[PDB]
């Protein structure tokens, strides 16, 4: 009902002041019961606030407090007092404009047009650009909305324009900020697939940008995106895709490269070769906790429609040091985990790790 948390300041010791309060605890309880109806057994006095915080308050072990959101956001914040502070378990704080935009969409899924989705993504891009706070409730919603757009555009064979693909990338860059990983970690505690869904949505949307809207390059701070059309040129040089991302915690740039030899294009050339990369994805794509491994390189993606590639070379820079045993892996959407089937290590330099996968 109404949990009342107070504090008693005294000049004695913690054990003496405590013992003194417990011995008159029933006389304080009878004085409070003359002003308010109290629950039986609720009076508990203790001299150690395990968790104490301005946002939530003080509480004992396993205590769980649920508080409302703030202005503009709708939902609730839940946290339980553990040995390490107030761990937020459920945060459902969603921006009103984001939720309001999410609710106009439910009336559009029925009769949806290619121009209607593009203006919707644009209205989404402006909302996140103006209010850039990537709260867990926002992260869950943006991933949801983008996936409802991706699934709608795929199930309708809509075409993502080049201005619409820029808005999706802008949205991605905002929610892929390095300051969102902690909140991303909270989201995965509930929706363990939201980070994979974002990656799958980005990849599915990228396949819908037609060759007429390419070449296209969106190099942001937390995500790079490059798409080119295919001509008889790919039969000659092969496909190359390079990135140079400079995070703040390293003076050295974290580089990545995809090399597809000209021999892999021997069959009938597809239509578009979309590639993209990011560093924050490495921290939000969950790795097995039983293993002490970790993503020590940029997450690199490359999509080719209706085309199977049997050999792709990938060059990954090492972000962190003192790590050994490089393990070339790809993100398995089906099993929701990193997987090494088809990818083998070629060579490890003091700076970059070279991989070679039998699938793309």
């Amino acid at each position: 009902s109404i949990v009342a948390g107070y504090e008693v300041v005294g000049s004695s010791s913690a054990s003496e002041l405590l013992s003194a309060i417990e011995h008159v605890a029933e006389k304080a309880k009878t004085a409070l019961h003359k002003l308010f109806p109290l629950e039986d057994g609720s009076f508990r006095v203790f001299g150690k606030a395990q968790c104490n915080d301005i946002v939530f308050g003080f509480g004992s072990k396993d205590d769980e407090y649920t508080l409302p959101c703030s202005s503009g956001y709708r939902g609730n914040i839940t946290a339980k007092c553990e040995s390490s502070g107030w761990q937020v378990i459920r945060e459902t704080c969603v921006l009103s404009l984001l939720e309001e935009l999410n609710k106009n969409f439910s009336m559009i899924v029925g009769n949806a047009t290619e121009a209607a989705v593009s203006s919707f993504v644009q209205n989404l891009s402006v909302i996140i650009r103006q209010n850039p706070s990537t709260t867990v409730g926002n992260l869950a919603s943006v991933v949801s909305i983008l996936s409802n757009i991706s699934s709608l555009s795929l199930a309708s064979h809509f075409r993502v324009s080049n201005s619409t693909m820029e808005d999706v990338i802008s949205i991605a860059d905002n929610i892929l900020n390095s300051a969102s990983v902690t909140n991303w970690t909270v989201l995965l505690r509930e929706e363990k697939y939201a980070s994979s869904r974002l990656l799958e949505t980005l990849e599915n949307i990228s396949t819908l940008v037609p060759p007429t809207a390419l070449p296209l390059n969106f190099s942001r701070k937390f995500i790079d995106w490059k798409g080119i059309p295919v001509n008889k040129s790919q039969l000659k040089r092969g496909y190359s895709y390079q990135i140079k991302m400079c995070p703040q915690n390293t003076s050295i740039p974290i580089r990545g490269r995809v090399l597809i030899g000209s021999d892999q294009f021997q069959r009938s050339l597809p239509e578009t070769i979309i590639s993209m990369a990011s560093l924050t994805l490495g921290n939000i794509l969950p790795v097995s906790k039983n293993g002490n491994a970790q993503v020590n390189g940029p997450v690199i993606s490359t999509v080719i429609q209706n085309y199977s590639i049997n050999e792709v070379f990938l060059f990954f820079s090492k972000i962190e040091s003192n790590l050994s045993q490089p393990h070339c892996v790809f993100w398995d959407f089906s099993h929701l985990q990193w997987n090494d089937a088809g990818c083998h290590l070629v060579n490890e330099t003091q700076d970059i790790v070279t991989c070679q996968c039998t699938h793309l």
Binding site: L199, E203, L281, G282, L285, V287, G291, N292, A293, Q294, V295, N296, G297, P298, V299, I300, S301, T302, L314, F316, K318, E320, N322, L323, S324, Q325, P326, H327, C328, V329, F330, W331, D332, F333, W338, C343, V353, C355, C357, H359, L360
Partner: peptide
């Protein structure tokens, strides 16, 4: 698909 690398810290013995 989407590729990266995993690395583990050196464990003695």
């Amino acid at each position: 698909t989407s590729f990266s690398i995993l690395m583990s810290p050196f464990v003695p013995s």
